[PDB]
């Protein structure tokens, strides 16, 4: 366009939006991470709890 | 204003800057899950270790 | 500049782009302490699998 600074802007903003999305995508990504080590955490302690009437 | 392509950076400056506050909480939410998974695993082990001097 | 509306978008661009770029690493780091979650969890199991044959 007739404003070179504008341009840039407008490009940095589209790189922005980009950037953005893509983090989004990267935390709830990890997200099934988290819960698959929570969940794994809670089955080993799960199964603890299963012979600790029997093993102390 | 008089500058419509300003108008629209500068309503798409203010939504980036409100998805990267979000994206902040959300990351600093999922620490929390985190060091909870975390958490709990050691004490998974902790109590391993409280029993594997005792049966192997 | 002769625009104060442009030097303050350009402004918080560079604002947005460093926050950006620190969410970034942010999730990276976060990485790292999912993995350990998730290491010590299987850790356990583990050492449970190596006694369930033996302890029920």
Same mark, same amino acid.
Not at 9 to 15: A, K, P
């Given at each position: 366009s007739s404003n070179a600074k504008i341009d840039q802007?407008?490009?940095? !903003? $589209?790189?922005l939006?980009?950037?953005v999305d893509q983090l989004?995508?990267?935390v709830?990504?990890?997200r099934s991470d !988290? $819960?698959?080590?929570?969940?794994?955490?809670?089955?080993?302690?799960?199964?603890?709890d299963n012979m600790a009437t029997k093993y102390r």
């Open positions: 802007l407008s490009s940095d !903003v $589209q790189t939006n980009a950037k989004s995508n990267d709830n990504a990890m !988290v $819960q698959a080590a929570k969940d794994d955490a809670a089955r080993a302690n799960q199964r603890l």
